Write a protein that binds this DNA or RNA. Structure first.
Ligand SMILES: Nc1ncnc2c1ncn2[C@@H]1O[C@H](CSCC[C@H](N)C(=O)O)[C@@H](O)[C@H]1O
Ligand SMILES: [Mg+2]
Ligand SMILES: [Mg+2]
Ligand SMILES: [Mg+2]
Ligand SMILES: [Mg+2]
Ligand SMILES: [Mg+2]
Ligand SMILES: [Mg+2]
Lengths: 239, 455, 448
RNA sequence: GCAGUGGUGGCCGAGUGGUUAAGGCGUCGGACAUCCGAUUCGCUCUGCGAGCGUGGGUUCGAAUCCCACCCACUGCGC
RNA sequence: GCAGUGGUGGCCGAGUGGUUAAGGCGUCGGACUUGAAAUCCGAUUCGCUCUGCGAGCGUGGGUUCGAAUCCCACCCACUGCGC
């Protein structure tokens, strides 16, 4: 049935290694820059807005919004050293606007690099699906302490019944809505209820949490397919 | 052989399960423990040999660089060697050579020992196998077809002579114990059986294939067992010397047909109807009704052979399909039989399960095995390196195909069954499905032309 | 082996004919003189041994009667028993020496005799170069037409041949035959067996290996080293794989007295043959043309040695083969093989060589041979059932002829029936082919 | 594969340490459906020699007693 | 069976004593792109204590610090012979 229970333990203990070898084999050429960020969230629109990018990758999510709006300071978090080195070697990088640092969002703590209750917006774009479902609230609590008590957290990631979930063969299933790719990285497909009751258990307040529907079409192969991402915004209670 | 990672417990393995299986087969446990210790030692020896090879490589690279930059004249590191004259690095290379040689001897010994322990551990058992060691008592009868209690006058040992189709004494003069000439009406009947079986299997989608009868030793080792390869196979010798062995079944060359290949999953259920002459050296007589042409040294056999996908329980559905094909063959021939599930202690090492079709011999009053259908899973494909996909994945290990085989028709034994079941007082009635393939005049009856040797 | 009375002027023989035949076969005429000297010495040795044995038996009879070397029975009875034992010791020494000499002479004579060939039939072309002097006797069909592919490409185009994997499994020349070509080979066997069975032949499936003590009597020394595989059992037996089913069929009646009434005894041998020599002579000899293992259907006849009946049967056998190949539509010519390229047993040989239009050559498909009593007297297969007093026995005549070697006949069929879309099935094999293969064997691969 | 008994002539059958391998039954020929003769190999042929599964041994002497192998049959293994 | 030339990865095909076994072709998965893809990014022999190191160029050996490259044997092909 599911993947061997021994193998799932090897996947959990080698999560950082699997992401590091991904950046080794694929360099910065796999993912593409996300220019839809500023438009999608009512924040990030056009003073000194300090931001934390949890799971920054090689950029692709902060460099666009950072060359767009020129009064944003950014913290960058990633547990893979290769991704950090790629972010630093980017020609668009300057220390006066970015502060990149490695931090395993489940084991390490964010206060060792960012000041408490300082960040006004933190982004979770396709980062939480790579974390084991039983260590996600760890990440939510780790980022709960650096958020300004009126600030918020922005989240887009895979949702239930997306096509990518359906392409996976049965030999790639770790559990309910929990799969693994050929390269070792994993994918959890969230539901609105699961994410809601995962954010509520760590002290957040739901604002918007609803699915976003798209489609993928390759004209040459004439392939058009449905896609289901879950977008949301949670807010830290004022008082 | 089994997958070595089934014994590594640091991987996802479990040698306790191999111990349980080795007990259920009534073989020697503790072979598993010898294997585990030999393998755990071989892994450390391999680590050490790789490290010695790395040091030798690094010495050679440094020497080459010193030479091409025109130089004036084992905790080693890259920078450490970069500070030595060429003569000193060669002095180090000599120590590396000695260590490498002794480690290589130790590693070859450990490899041979681990392998001779591994080749004597049997395949995992299907949970349907009856756990036992008494074949006569616990062999489970699954199905019965026809009337398996009727009695008739003559046994095949008399019937082959009353039709004048058998020459035993002259055969033993020509070939020796058990040699025989088949002649007259029984050559036509054997050919009719071959035509009928090939046509049936071809209509089912099997590819008829006529195999070579000499297999080389290098290839026969990978498809045979120790005991068989030792005392059951004839050895052929030409001019020179001679490593060739007469095949004991067509399943052996057909298994080596896709040897060392990456088979596309599409077209994976390849079905082969092998046709060859088989040469078996063991012929023991347990009474009179096992003589004649029943147990002989040479005979033609038609075999089913299927390479299958290892996923989705497909090889077990294929197993049922193959036994059903043989069943329908013998039902169209009108021969009564029962199906028996063989006990754990009687399976060979490769089989996870084995079914046998045992035909009722009314003139002998016995059940005799005609068909033998086995599912050997990936035990042999792993040895022959017959991979299931064309592409190897990034991290996953290679998967192997399952290989099933099943006798369709051994001609001598089936002739004996037909003779015993179709005898009348005037001759042998020809089965309705074989009348197409018989000559005119031999399409209704094979007449008795000699008296019974017992009478 | 020839009758030893042919070399004895005392009997109604003479070795001059044997010398002239050894010359016609372009063999050594000097073997005959060595044989004659060995035989003339052996007769003396045998006479002396018989006289010594006679004296020994008389000594024993005298001792036995009394208990209950010019020595007459009377001159021996007037002695004590100890004296007779001394005489017996003398006789034993003499007998030992004489038996040593006689065994040496017998071995020498049989060595020189197994290398002298059968007498020749006056029709045999006397020459040594086969390619110019082989007398073509009759033509059938169109032996000049030419077509596109040779069999080496056709067996692959129909997907019925696996040479590379066969050479991995079995080695040089090993092969798998698959698919449509297995059905075609089986159809050929069925058609040949029914053709021969309608003519009065008895089908016979033979053992594939033979004890060495029996194989010596049907084969030559050249064959064992050069062409016979050796089978090894357990405990290290001495069996050989047969090179042709004529060898076991010949030994089927060894040491028998056949009734003259049943003598045209005709057998249709069916077996697998194993040859070691597969040497190649270009591309058109590759494929399944010269292989180590192939099925063959044979004609074997035991005949009366009287009234020219053996030669009438010889003509009948070659006519049976010719009709088989005319009904298949294979063009051929019949060739009278020259005396230089005859085996020792044959007194005349006719080959049927078929035209290969894709290869542009004649290839031998049938070989018909009349060995007269060469092998019958070595196997002791005797003509009459009763022996006359003071009259030597006569042995039967033995003839063998290939009916169909299946691989070569498949090659000839493929080359002669190829079209642009596949191979047309010969009209006579359609009833023995599976449905779907009764009009055309389709091409499914490109030509290499 | 081992552990029990076996192996006679064209066939079957006697055969005991001293045969003409008896008797039959075939078959061939001759005499007229009976009778007679012949009916393994060799030789310098009207007699001698050899051959009793095949080889050897013991004995003056072996078809006969001993052994090995081969092939059967009866039980085991498989 | 001789007396010549040859044998590279799933396939083709480079390879020059210091490869990363090039380039293709085939196959297989991953895709998060709002500037989505009539495509992009990769993987693709074996082994080990796996971000690396080791082995592997028909198979075995030799020479060399170092060989897929040079030598030998065997095996299997092709070209000429014997048969
Ligand atoms: N538990 C964890 N702690 C910190 N980073 C993690 C993490 N789990 C996964 N990641 C990082 O999250 C990244 C997801 S790839 C997505 C990158 C980014 N969201 C973008 O839009 O480009 C990976 O690079 C991985 O390194
Ligand atoms: Mg007898
Ligand atoms: Mg008598
Ligand atoms: Mg004897
Ligand atoms: Mg290649
Ligand atoms: Mg490449
Ligand atoms: Mg090599």
């Amino acid at each position: 049935t599911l993947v061997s229970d021994f193998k799932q333990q090897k996947l959990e203990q080698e999560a950082q290694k699997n992401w590091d070898l991904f950046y080794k084999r694929n360099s910065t050429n796999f993912f593409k820059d996300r220019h839809w960020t500023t438009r999608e969230f009512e924040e990030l629109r056009s003073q000194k807005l300090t931001m934390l990018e949890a799971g920054c990758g090689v950029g692709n999510c902060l460099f666009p919004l950072l060359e767009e709006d020129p009064n944003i300071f950014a913290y960058a978090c990633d547990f893979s050293p290769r991704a950090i080195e790629y972010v630093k070697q980017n020609p668009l990088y300057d220390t006066e606007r970015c502060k990149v640092f490695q931090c395993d969002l489940t084991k390490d703590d964010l206060l060792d690099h960012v000041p408490p209750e300082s960040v006004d917006v933190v982004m979770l774009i396709f980062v939480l699906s790579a974390v084991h479902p039983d260590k996600m609230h760890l990440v939510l609590q780790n980022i709960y302490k650096v958020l300004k008590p009126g600030k918020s957290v922005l989240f887009r990631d895979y949702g239930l019944y997306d096509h990518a979930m359906l392409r996976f063969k049965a030999s790639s299933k770790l559990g309910e809505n929990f799969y693994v790719r050929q390269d070792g990285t994993r994918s959890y497909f969230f539901t609105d209820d699961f994410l809601a009751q995962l954010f509520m258990d760590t002290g957040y307040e739901e604002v918007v949490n609803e699915y976003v529907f798209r489609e993928t079409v390759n004209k040459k192969e004439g392939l058009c397919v449905p896609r289901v991402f879950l977008q949301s915004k949670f807010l830290k209670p004022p008082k | 052989v089994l997958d070595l990672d089934l014994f590594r417990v640091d991987k996802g393995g479990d040698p306790a399960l191999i111990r349980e299986t080795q007990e259920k087969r009534f073989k020697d446990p503790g072979l598993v423990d010898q294997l585990v210790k030999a393998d755990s030692e071989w892994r450390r020896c391999r680590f050490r040999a790789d490290n010695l090879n790395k040091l030798k490589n690094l010495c050679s690279k440094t020497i080459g660089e010193k030479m091409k930059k025109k130089e004036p004249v084992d905790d080693l590191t890259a920078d450490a060697l970069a500070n030595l004259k060429v003569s000193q690095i060669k002095k180090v290379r000599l120590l590396i050579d000695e260590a490498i040689l002794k480690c290589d001897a130790e590693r070859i010994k450990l490899e041979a020992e681990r392998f001779e322990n591994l080749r004597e551990i049997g395949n995992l058992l299907h949970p349907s196998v009856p756990i036992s060691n008494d074949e006569d008592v616990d062999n489970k009868v699954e199905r019965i077809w026809g009337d398996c209690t009727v009695r008739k006058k003559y046994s095949h040992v008399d019937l082959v002579v009353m039709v004048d189709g058998f020459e035993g004494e002259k055969g033993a003069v020509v070939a020796g114990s058990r040699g025989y000439f088949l002649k007259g009406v029984l050559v036509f009947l054997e050919q009719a059986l071959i035509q009928y079986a090939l046509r049936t299997l071809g209509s089912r989608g099997y590819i008829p294939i006529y195999t070579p009868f000499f297999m080389r030793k290098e290839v026969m080792q990978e498809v045979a067992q120790l005991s068989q390869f030792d005392e059951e196979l004839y050895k052929v010798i030409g001019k020179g010397s001679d490593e060739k062995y007469l095949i004991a079944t067509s399943e052996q060359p057909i298994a080596a047909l896709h040897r060392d290949e990456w088979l596309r999953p599409e077209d994976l259920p390849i079905k082969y109807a092998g046709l060859s002459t088989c040469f078996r050296q063991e012929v023991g007589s347990h009474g009179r009704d096992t003589r004649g042409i029943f147990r002989v040294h040479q005979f033609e056999k038609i075999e089913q052979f299927v390479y299958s996908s290892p996923h989705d329980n497909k090889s077990w559905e294929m197993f049922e399909e193959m036994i059903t094909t043989a069943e329908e063959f013998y039902q169209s021939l009108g021969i009564p039989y029962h199906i028996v599930n063989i006990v754990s202690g009687s399976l060979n090492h490769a089989a996870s399960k084995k079914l046998d079709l045992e035909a009722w011999f009314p003139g002998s009053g016995a059940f005799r095995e005609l068909v033998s259908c086995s599912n050997c899973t990936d035990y042999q494909a792993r040895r022959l390196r017959i991979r299931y996909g064309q592409t190897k994945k990034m991290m996953d290990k290679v998967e192997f195909v399952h290989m099933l085989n099943a006798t369709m028709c051994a001609t001598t034994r089936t002739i004996c069954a037909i003779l015993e079941n179709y005898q009348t007082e005037k001759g042998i009635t020809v089965p309705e499905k074989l009348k197409e393939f018989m000559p005119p005049g031999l399409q209704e009856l094979i007449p008795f032309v000699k008296p019974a040797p017992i009478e």
